[PDB]
Amino acid sequence: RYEAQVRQHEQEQLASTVISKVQSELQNAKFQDKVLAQAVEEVERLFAK
Amino acid sequence: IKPPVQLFGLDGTYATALFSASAKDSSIEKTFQSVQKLSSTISKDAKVAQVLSNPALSLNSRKEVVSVLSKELKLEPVVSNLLTVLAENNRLSLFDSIAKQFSVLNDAYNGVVEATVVSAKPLDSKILNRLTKSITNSKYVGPGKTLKASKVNKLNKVLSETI
Amino acid sequence: GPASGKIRAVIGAVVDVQFEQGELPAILNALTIDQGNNQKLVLEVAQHLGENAVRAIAMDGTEGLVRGQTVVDTGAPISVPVGRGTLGRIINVVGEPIDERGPIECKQRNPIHADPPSFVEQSTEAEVLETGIKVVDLLAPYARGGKIGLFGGAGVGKTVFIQELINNIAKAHGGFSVFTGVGERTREGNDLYREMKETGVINLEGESKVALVFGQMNEPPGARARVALTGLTIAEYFRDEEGQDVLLFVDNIFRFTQAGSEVSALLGRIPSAVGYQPTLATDMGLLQERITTTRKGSVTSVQAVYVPADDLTDPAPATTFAHLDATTVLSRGISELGIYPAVDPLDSKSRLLDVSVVGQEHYDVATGVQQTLQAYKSLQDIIAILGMDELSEQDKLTVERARKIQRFLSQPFAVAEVFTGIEGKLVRLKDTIASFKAVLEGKYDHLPENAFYMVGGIEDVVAKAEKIAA
Amino acid sequence: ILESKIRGVSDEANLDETGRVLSVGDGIARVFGLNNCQAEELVEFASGVKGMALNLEPGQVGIVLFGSDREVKEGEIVKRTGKIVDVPIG
Amino acid sequence: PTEVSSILESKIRGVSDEANLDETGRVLSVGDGIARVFGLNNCQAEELVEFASGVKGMALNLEPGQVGIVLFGSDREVKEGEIVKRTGKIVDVPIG
Numbered sequence: 001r002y003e004a005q006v007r008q009h010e011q012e013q014l015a016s017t018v019i020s021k022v023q024s025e026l027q028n029a030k031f032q033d034k035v036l037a038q039a040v041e042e043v044e045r046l047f048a049k
Numbered sequence: 050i051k052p053p054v055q056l057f058g059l060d061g062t063y064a065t066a067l068f069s070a071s072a073k074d075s076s077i078e079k080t081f082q083s084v085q086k087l088s089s090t091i092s093k094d095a096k097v098a099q100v101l102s103n104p105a106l107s108l109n110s111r112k113e114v115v116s117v118l119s120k121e122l123k124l125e126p127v128v129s130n131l132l133t134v135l136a137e138n139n140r141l142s143l144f145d146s147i148a149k150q151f152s153v154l155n156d157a158y159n160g161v162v163e164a165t166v167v168s169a170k171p172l173d174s175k176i177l178n179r180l181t182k183s184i185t186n187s188k189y190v191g192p193g194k195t196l197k198a199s200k201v202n203k204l205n206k207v208l209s210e211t212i
Numbered sequence: 213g214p215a216s217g218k219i220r221a222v223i224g225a226v227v228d229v230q231f232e233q234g235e236l237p238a239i240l241n242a243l244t245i246d247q248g249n250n251q252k253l254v255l256e257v258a259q260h261l262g263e264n265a266v267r268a269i270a271m272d273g274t275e276g277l278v279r280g281q282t283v284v285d286t287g288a289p290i291s292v293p294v295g296r297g298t299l300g301r302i303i304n305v306v307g308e309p310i311d312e313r314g315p316i317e318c319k320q321r322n323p324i325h326a327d328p329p330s331f332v333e334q335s336t337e338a339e340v341l342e343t344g345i346k347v348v349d350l351l352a353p354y355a356r357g358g359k360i361g362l363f364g365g366a367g368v369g370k371t372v373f374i375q376e377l378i379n380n381i382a383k384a385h386g387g388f389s390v391f392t393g394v395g396e397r398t399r400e401g402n403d404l405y406r407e408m409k410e411t412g413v414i415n416l417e418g419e420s421k422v423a424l425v426f427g428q429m430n431e432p433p434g435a436r437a438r439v440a441l442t443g444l445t446i447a448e449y450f451r452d453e454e455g456q457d458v459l460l461f462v463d464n465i466f467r468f469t470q471a472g473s474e475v476s477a478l479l480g481r482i483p484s485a486v487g488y489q490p491t492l493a494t495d496m497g498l499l500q501e502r503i504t505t506t507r508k509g510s511v512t513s514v515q516a517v518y519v520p521a522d523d524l525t526d527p528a529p530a531t532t533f534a535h536l537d538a539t540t541v542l543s544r545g546i547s548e549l550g551i552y553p554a555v556d557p558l559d560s561k562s563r564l565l566d567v568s569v570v571g572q573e574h575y576d577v578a579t580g581v582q583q584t585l586q587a588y589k590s591l592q593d594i595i596a597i598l599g600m601d602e603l604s605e606q607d608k609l610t611v612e613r614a615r616k617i618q619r620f621l622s623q624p625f626a627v628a629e630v631f632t633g634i635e636g637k638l639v640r641l642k643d644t645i646a647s648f649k650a651v652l653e654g655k656y657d658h659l660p661e662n663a664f665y666m667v668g669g670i671e672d673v674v675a676k677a678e679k680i681a682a
Numbered sequence: 683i684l685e686s687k688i689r690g691v692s693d694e695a696n697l698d699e700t701g702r703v704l705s706v707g708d709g710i711a712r713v714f715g716l717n718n719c720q721a722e723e724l725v726e727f728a729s730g731v732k733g734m735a736l737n738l739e740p741g742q743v744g745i746v747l748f749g750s751d752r753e754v755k756e757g758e759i760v761k762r763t764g765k766i767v768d769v770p771i772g
Numbered sequence: 773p774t775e776v777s778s779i780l781e782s783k784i785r786g787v788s789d790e791a792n793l794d795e796t797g798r799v800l801s802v803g804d805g806i807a808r809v810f811g812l813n814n815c816q817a818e819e820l821v822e823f824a825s826g827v828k829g830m831a832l833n834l835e836p837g838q839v840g841i842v843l844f845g846s847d848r849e850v851k852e853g854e855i856v857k858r859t860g861k862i863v864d865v866p867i868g
């Protein structure tokens with residue numbers, strides 16, 4: 001029970017730190033995230049028409 | 050003639066009842082500008098609004114006030130019959146609902162609607178909706194689009210459910 | 213700038229706020245309305261009627277509000293003070309102090325609306341809690357960390373039963389207390405604060421261990437329904453963040469469901485049974501599940517229910533019986549005979565009444581005492597019409613033993629010394645089991661029926677019979 | 683601005699502190715108006731009967747008459763007292 | 773076993789890749805568990821509905837202008853104007 005609680009606490013702490021790093025990267029004005037969002041919308045509409 | 054737009058059935062049938070008689074001899078273009086003058090001269094005026102929203106007056110007093118204001122505004126065709134039906138049946142308190150439902154019939158049978166993201170879309174008047182939405186989404190994403198979310202919220206909810 | 217709204221409708225406790233912007237408030241949101249008394253006006257959001265308008269419920273009097281008043285949103289729910297700073301002070305439903313002793317210097321402020329514990333965070337036990345009464349330590353024994361229900365009618369003994377148990381269990385429990393009164397009287401709140409200060413429970417110049425929450429029946433319907441959520445938030449922080457055995461004392465618990473039924477007709481909901489709200493089992497289950505024992509700490513809930521016009525089949529009395537481990541029903545017929553209190557042995561039940569928790573000796577004495585009282589109650593139609601001489605030889609001995617066993621379980625409490633005139637008797641758990649087993653075997657059949665009425669154990673019954681015969 | 687004087691139906695009713703009675707019955711009086719009227723405030727009818735505005739929704743206000751129903755008709759002028767339901771003391 | 777946290781991050785990497793086809797509505801009123809959703813003409817009776825906040829719903833009352841859906845959780849996060857997407861299936865549960 002102590003080994004399972006230590007593994008669950010380490011996984012919960014690593015997931016909280018990874019979620020904070022992903023939110024801080026999007027607020028730094030990512031030029032690669034804005035160009036990939038426009039190309040993904042045009043490729044999805046061409047496959048359904 | 051009944052168009053497929055539903056629009057409720059009781060309260061929304063006020064503008065749909067007069068649209069059948071106005072769709073003859075090309076009389077739908079003059080009804081759009083005449084319906085906007087009746088609501089603009091009652092809302093931002095503070096004169097005929099308080100004298101008509103009360104439960105007083107009579108049947109002949111309500112019909113004489115609508116005919117006197119329509120002779121000096123912009124009403125001479127079938128615009129005078131719309132105000133006389135709402136005066137005898139006590140329906141003058143909801144004049145904004147009858148004018149808003151009349152503009153939705155011309156935009157549905159001669160144009161698109163709905164939305165997409167951020168603000169409004171384009172609402173073209175071509176034919177199909179598949180060939181008009183693909184040619185307007187590429188021209189509107191490049192020009193403008195301040196982007197001031199949906200993909201970041203879906204990725205965070207999937208990681209919390211597996212932990 | 214916060215979210216500001218405009219008052220569009222006002223009908224009693226319900227006040228519909230129409231927001232001009234698109235960012236409308238959510239459910240259970242605390243709204244602020246400026247007036248002119250350095251207190252503003254609290255308002256909790258209920259539902260949303262649409263068209264940029266949400267119906268809110270005010271927590272105070274809505275007299276004086278006009279159509280179009282400014283209603284600012286706080287952005288969260290009704291927060292209250294928690295921790296060790298709320299001990300000894302008289303808080304209200306909005307967390308403000310009403311004891312005229314300055315503001316509560318608390319570190320954190322938790323909201324009144326919170327989720328309860330899950331299935332993996334629950335912790336069940338079977339520890340018996342000794343109260344001191346002879347009718348509670350043998351019939352329906354209470355459990356430590358569970359929910360105790362004191363059901364009864366008007367004038368039976370619901371307020372006196374909660375006061376006697378708090379003066380002999382909460383004074384030596386070790387943990388902090390939480391006396392949150394909802395729907396009580398105006399004189400009951402002032403008398404409870406003065407009695408606890410002279411005994412060492414609430415020290416104004418020292419250390420305290422009992423949280424007081426105001427909220428009588430003199431307020432509106434919004435403050436009475438929110439009084440249970442403000443008192444339960446302070447007791448939940450001492451058992452989860454600190455890990456202490458808190459003691460929640462509600463008086464009464466039936467005022468939480470009666471306050472919401474008066475405001476349910478103005479919110480658009482249809483009436484249910486006996487003119488109640490449709491969400492009776494959903495509103496009562498969300499507050500009773502949070503006052504349970506978890507893995508971090510326990511919470512002994514000692515609430516009291518009020519029977520509507522002496523009826524246990526009501527929608528506010530029958531729905532609260534499925535969320536309590538021990539029940540103490542107080543019948544109105546036994547209170548007029550002289551039983552102090554009117555502890556009904558045929559209606560009070562508990563989950564700790566077994567042979568694996570109280571032992572084989574205590575389980576046999578509880579079954580033998582309940583079997584003798586059930587035989588005399590079923591034969592009441594022949595004793596009241598034909599008489600006591602129509603019985604046989606076996607039925608005559610069982611009728612005499614049932615009358616002495618019913619009066620022996622009624623002990624005089626310490627708080628009821630001015631109404632009875634006798635001293636307070638606190639019988640132990642081992643003394644109550646030995647006294648009931650000796651009277652049922654035939655060792656006290658020669659004594660009178662008045663020697664056991666308003667007494668203690670077997671020692672007080674032998675001393676009262678010798679003084680009356682001299 | 684041209685449709686104000688062209689009507690001629692007495693467009694000068696002060697609905698800020700007064701209101702018109704739309705309906706009356708079962709000890710109630712549905713007053714149309716009184717935007718500045720507070721909740722549980724005292725009112726006065728045209729015949730002299732007192733009233734208490736209980737519910738105040740949008741466009742209407744439910745006034746509870748403290749007298750008979752024959753002293754209030756449709757289209758009457760109901761004025762506001764400015765205060766709540768008070769009484770004399772001393 | 774040998775960094776168990778790295779196996780969960782690699783399996784939940786690529787998942788969101790086909791969720792751009794509308795199939796949603798608009799909530800007009802919600803409260804006391806009920807939620808009047810305006811729209812969703814393709815929603816069948818007793819169908820599983822998914823709100824924008826994450827709370828599940830079940831459309832049990834279908835009208836001509838609105839659609840009464842019963843929420844399966846708390847209505848504190850659902851407000852007016854929220855998107856109520858439809859899953860396309862009925863109220864099912866796991867078995868086996």
Ligand SMILES: Nc1ncnc2c1ncn2[C@@H]1O[C@H](COP(=O)(O)OP(=O)(O)O)[C@@H](O)[C@H]1O
Binds near residue numbers: 623
């Ligand atoms: N142990 C007791 N002995 C004598 N009288 C009692 C005892 N317990 C309660 N009572 C009586 O019961 C009454 C209860 O009154 P009250 O608290 O107003 O009603 P309720 O108990 O229904 O809330 C008191 O007036 C008190 O005299």
Ligand SMILES: [Mg+2]
Binds near residue numbers: 370372
């Ligand atoms: Mg009481």
